[PDB]
Amino acid sequence: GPGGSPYLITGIPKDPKHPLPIRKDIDDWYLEQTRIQLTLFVEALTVIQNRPLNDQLSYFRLAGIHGAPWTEWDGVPGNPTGFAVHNNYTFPTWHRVYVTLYEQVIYEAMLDFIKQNVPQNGKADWENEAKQWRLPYWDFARFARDELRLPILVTMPMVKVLVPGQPGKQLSKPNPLYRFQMQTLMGTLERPYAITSFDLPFDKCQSTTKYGLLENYNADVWADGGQNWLRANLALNEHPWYQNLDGWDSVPTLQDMTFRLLTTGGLNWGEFSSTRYDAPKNWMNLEAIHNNVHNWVGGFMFSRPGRHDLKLWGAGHMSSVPVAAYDPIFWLHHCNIDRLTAIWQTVNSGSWFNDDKSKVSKDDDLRPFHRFCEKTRKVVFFRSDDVKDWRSLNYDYAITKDASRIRKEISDLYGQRTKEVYKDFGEEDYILSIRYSRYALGGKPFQINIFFGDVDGKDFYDARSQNFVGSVFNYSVLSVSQLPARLAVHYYKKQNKGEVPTPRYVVVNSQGKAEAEVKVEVALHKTEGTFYDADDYRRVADGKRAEVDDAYRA
Amino acid sequence: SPYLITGIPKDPKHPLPIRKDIDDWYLEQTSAGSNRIQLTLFVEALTVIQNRPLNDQLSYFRLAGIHGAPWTEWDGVPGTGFAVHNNYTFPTWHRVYVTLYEQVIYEAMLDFIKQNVPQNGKADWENEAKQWRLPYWDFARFARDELRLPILVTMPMVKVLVPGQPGKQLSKPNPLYRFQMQTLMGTLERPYAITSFDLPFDKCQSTTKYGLLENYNADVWADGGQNWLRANLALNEHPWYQNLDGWDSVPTLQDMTFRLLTTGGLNWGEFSSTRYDDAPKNWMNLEAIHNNVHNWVGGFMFSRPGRHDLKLWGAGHMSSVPVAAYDPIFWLHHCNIDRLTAIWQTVNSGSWFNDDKSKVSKDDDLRPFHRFCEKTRKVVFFRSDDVKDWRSLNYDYAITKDASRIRKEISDLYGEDYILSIRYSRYALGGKPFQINIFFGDVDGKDFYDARSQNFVGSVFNYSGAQQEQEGVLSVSQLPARLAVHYYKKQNKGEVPTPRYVVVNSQGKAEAEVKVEVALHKTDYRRVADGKRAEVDDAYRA
Numbered sequence A: 001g002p003g004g005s006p007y008l009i010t011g012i013p014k015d016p017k018h019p020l021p022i023r024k025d026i027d028d029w030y031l032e033q034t035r036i037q038l039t040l041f042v043e044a045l046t047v048i049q050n051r052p053l054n055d056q057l058s059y060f061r062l063a064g065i066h067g068a069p070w071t072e073w074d075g076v077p078g079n080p081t082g083f084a085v086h087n088n089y090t091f092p093t094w095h096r097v098y099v100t101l102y103e104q105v106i107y108e109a110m111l112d113f114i115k116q117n118v119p120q121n122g123k124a125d126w127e128n129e130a131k132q133w134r135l136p137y138w139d140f141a142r143f144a145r146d147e148l149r150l151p152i153l154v155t156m157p158m159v160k161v162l163v164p165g166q167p168g169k170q171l172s173k174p175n176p177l178y179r180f181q182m183q184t185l186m187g188t189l190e191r192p193y194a195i196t197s198f199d200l201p202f203d204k205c206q207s208t209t210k211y212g213l214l215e216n217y218n219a220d221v222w223a224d225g226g227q228n229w230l231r232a233n234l235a236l237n238e239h240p241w242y243q244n245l246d247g248w249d250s251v252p253t254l255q256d257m258t259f260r261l262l263t264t265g266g267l268n269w270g271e272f273s274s275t276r277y278d279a280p281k282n283w284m285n286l287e288a289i290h291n292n293v294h295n296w297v298g299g300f301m302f303s304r305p306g307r308h309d310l311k312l313w314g315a316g317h318m319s320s321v322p323v324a325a326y327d328p329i330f331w332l333h334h335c336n337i338d339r340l341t342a343i344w345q346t347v348n349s350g351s352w353f354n355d356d357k358s359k360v361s362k363d364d365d366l367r368p369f370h371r372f373c374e375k376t377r378k379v380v381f382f383r384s385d386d387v388k389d390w391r392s393l394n395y396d397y398a399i400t401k402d403a404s405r406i407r408k409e410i411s412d413l414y415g416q417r418t419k420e421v422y423k424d425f426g427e428e429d430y431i432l433s434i435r436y437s438r439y440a441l442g443g444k445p446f447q448i449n450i451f452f453g454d455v456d457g458k459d460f461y462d463a464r465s466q467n468f469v470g471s472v473f474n475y476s477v478l479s480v481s482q483l484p485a486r487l488a489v490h491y492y493k494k495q496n497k498g499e500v501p502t503p504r505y506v507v508v509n510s511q512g513k514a515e516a517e518v519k520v521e522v523a524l525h526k527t528e529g530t531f532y533d534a535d536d537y538r539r540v541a542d543g544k545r546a547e548v549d550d551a552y553r554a
Numbered sequence B: 001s002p003y004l005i006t007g008i009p010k011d012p013k014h015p016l017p018i019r020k021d022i023d024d025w026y027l028e029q030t031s032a033g034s035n036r037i038q039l040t041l042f043v044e045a046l047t048v049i050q051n052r053p054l055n056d057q058l059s060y061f062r063l064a065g066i067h068g069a070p071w072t073e074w075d076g077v078p079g080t081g082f083a084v085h086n087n088y089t090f091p092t093w094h095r096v097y098v099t100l101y102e103q104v105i106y107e108a109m110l111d112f113i114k115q116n117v118p119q120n121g122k123a124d125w126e127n128e129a130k131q132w133r134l135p136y137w138d139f140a141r142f143a144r145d146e147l148r149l150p151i152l153v154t155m156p157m158v159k160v161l162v163p164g165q166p167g168k169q170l171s172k173p174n175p176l177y178r179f180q181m182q183t184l185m186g187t188l189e190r191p192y193a194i195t196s197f198d199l200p201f202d203k204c205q206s207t208t209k210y211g212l213l214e215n216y217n218a219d220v221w222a223d224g225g226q227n228w229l230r231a232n233l234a235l236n237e238h239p240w241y242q243n244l245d246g247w248d249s250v251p252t253l254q255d256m257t258f259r260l261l262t263t264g265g266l267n268w269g270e271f272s273s274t275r276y277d278d279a280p281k282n283w284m285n286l287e288a289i290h291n292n293v294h295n296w297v298g299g300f301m302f303s304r305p306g307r308h309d310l311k312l313w314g315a316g317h318m319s320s321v322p323v324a325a326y327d328p329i330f331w332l333h334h335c336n337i338d339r340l341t342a343i344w345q346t347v348n349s350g351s352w353f354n355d356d357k358s359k360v361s362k363d364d365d366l367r368p369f370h371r372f373c374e375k376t377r378k379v380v381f382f383r384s385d386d387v388k389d390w391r392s393l394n395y396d397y398a399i400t401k402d403a404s405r406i407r408k409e410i411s412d413l414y415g416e417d418y419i420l421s422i423r424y425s426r427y428a429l430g431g432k433p434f435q436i437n438i439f440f441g442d443v444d445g446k447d448f449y450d451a452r453s454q455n456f457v458g459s460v461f462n463y464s465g466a467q468q469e470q471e472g473v474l475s476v477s478q479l480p481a482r483l484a485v486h487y488y489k490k491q492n493k494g495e496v497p498t499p500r501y502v503v504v505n506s507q508g509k510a511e512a513e514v515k516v517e518v519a520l521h522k523t524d525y526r527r528v529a530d531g532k533r534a535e536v537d538d539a540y541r542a
């Protein structure tokens, strides 16, 4: 660490005037200030982003822990892989520590900012705000203040901040949450830090981008492809195709998935914590939802075959495990994944590494994260049990302050629209199970799209594609996910004399082409009763690969 | 003051330097090799001009201010803007305006060299400044199968040379990407603030393309971004049927530009302007094409009624006369409008303010632009005859260097008939902008906007913004219709379509009360059908 000793991760230190401060919803937090906390977060994160690459607490090196360029960090040596855990049962706990590292570094930068910039009259007030501040979360599953959206702040290129010592003065500055920008293309950073198999030109980017990388544009456009936040919002609101037709109400699949994740009882830790697969009702897991959000924020398709005026594709850092951590929204996404873990823990309190598969991983060192063990007086790595109680890291969430009311809060935040629309149809539920190998395309990402009915051989991509039901993203031993299917099955039955649909799937690569030799096991399952009134699911149809037009075949 | 507009001064090592296609130029600058001196000079000079204070009349803000809001004086001429629209001096007023911008940039390049280039490098850098001319954006040329905004306009940052530190290139914010002020434009010091209008330009710090949408936090409008992919989609507007499987497409903008340049027999009055002062074949004019390009680059619709997951609307500075000049692409669009004028002049050499309609306007003073009169040794305003030969301002275009090959170059670049004629009042909505959309067949009452709307054929944009037009004056445009009539007949038992139109406002609603004269003509063109307004759903009616 800095000054030649391990960097001890503690969370923000405990102050008795500041009992368990909460991580707030970033839109609520911004809206109440649209101002010292906003100023401190902006100015501290700007400093951290501008730190040199040799500084291990620079934004670049902190993001670098996750994936590329796969260097050492804090004395811990660095298919090339990073420190991050994916497709294993420590996925939530490794990321709980990682988010806390980021929050702690930001807090320390806030204190430094105050020491260097704030006059005597205001130091105590500004220090007080730094001590109350916690990293906000992005509630990707909550309607923004009728639709799911990226945070307001992430969509603003500039942000107004206070000028300490100049009352009433504010300055507009580049917003460090909008993008992370380096001084040169990341493929040409000083060794060993160059970002350089990847199937997207991330070596040619200077800044992070959402949907900005498309084939057939000048390579200098890729240096900074922009933040297509409207396109990301569209993706985040994915739902079955039939719901864009007149006379049908829509429900965002991400909100239905999240409501199911939090409300479904009976999962063990191994089922909840990960996509890893060594009863399909239990395949709705945290990591699978997290994987889809990565795709929907960044985009993963660089190209599409054929000629298309409207170009709905485009790729960006958040879809790509090696470089997703560079996008500032990464940390806000993982702050909410940590919040979801804390909520699920609260309503499943005995289910902690409690199954035979996850028990084996409970004691894994969560490298490269150090802490001082007070019992053995040694610097050690974090382990999952150290962070079972997130409050040991001196933060909390409003929703986990009161267990007795958490089930009503879950329903109010995530369940209203699902229940409103589901209530219009009979008392049955349908789900799709999906099982795949994350290595099926040699480690390259891919998207599994499911359809009920005939597939358009030139349009098999998203909610605009005929008969689309939903998607599963391989964000770079098998892997499982689950999709809601209740509403899409109802629509199909109405057009097909009551017949249960055969799920048809297409595996799409980053060129927009269908991969014919990626195995996916898809099935449709039914139970009597609605899921939120809970069941006994039974398989009712087996999946089949769909064919596409010859020009659209990999 | 007065600021004498001359064009870049002549230097015998630089005979009549050309204004290059900005994409070709950008590729030469960055691909030929590392010596990107003209690109560095343009970037650095325009940055300096954009950062000049408001009381400097050669600041970017004040130069853009000549066109429209905030409607102040310039160069001692008291400050409707100075810009000429819907009159026959539209091309010549803008010829002078573009030359002013080019000249100010060149002078700033010379200052940059004085400030930053070492003595032993100054000759090399000055040689590049003296060869540079303002590039044009060829909005009608396929980009190096589709029409596109310039490469450089779509780049947030640009690498430049640092003089005296060889091989050292630095990445800087690109002043062609946007114009960004330090505060919201509605809060600038008197008299310069931009400040009822339907688009929240007072709440913008930066220019935007499609960035302003209703139902987002107002702080998003401070900088709505550059949705250049959405602008490119608009620029490639064509009939809806061409997106069906089996059909090839042809961008309407390229067809319109080809027709503008190759149709013979127009007088200056017909070519130069949308103005119609009381033959439909001759209504394809320079200003109408220019008007649609403004809409396609910027966006004009702030909202849309109803429920839509895919949000294709969004508004931006280039759609709006009062603020369009703030977007740096404005100048590159106008550079190409100047180029199209020069091409048309070359192939129509005796047609210059000499029909009975346009002759009237020939001697208008092109306020606020000054020049020195050698005859009287007095400062005077520019007049159109002063810029009939654009080479007198010491620039040229590659395409007008060899008249003998011009017909073939026009064909290489941009190449029964049916056409649609459109005649409208710019003040049909009191001066507010609107878009006239034309359909062959049934109109979808909730989707009557663009090429994704069923049966869409083409659009006419009113680039304007209770007032009335000049008495006796209206505006005209023309659209190609051959391919669209062929599809319609094929699908509809050979019926010649009745054009159906909708007049759309900035809220995405149909203005039922507006009447436009739309007609279909067929080849020597005969009128074969008259247009009729189409109804839309109740929730989408203004």
Ligand SMILES: [Cu+2]
Binding pocket: A066, A084, A085, A086, A095
């Ligand atoms: Cu991770």
Ligand SMILES: [Cu+2]
Binding pocket: A290, A294, A324, A333, A334
């Ligand atoms: Cu993640």
Ligand SMILES: [Cu+2]
Binding pocket: B067, B083, B084, B085, B094
């Ligand atoms: Cu103008």
Ligand SMILES: [Cu+2]
Binding pocket: B290, B294, B324, B333, B334
């Ligand atoms: Cu213009």
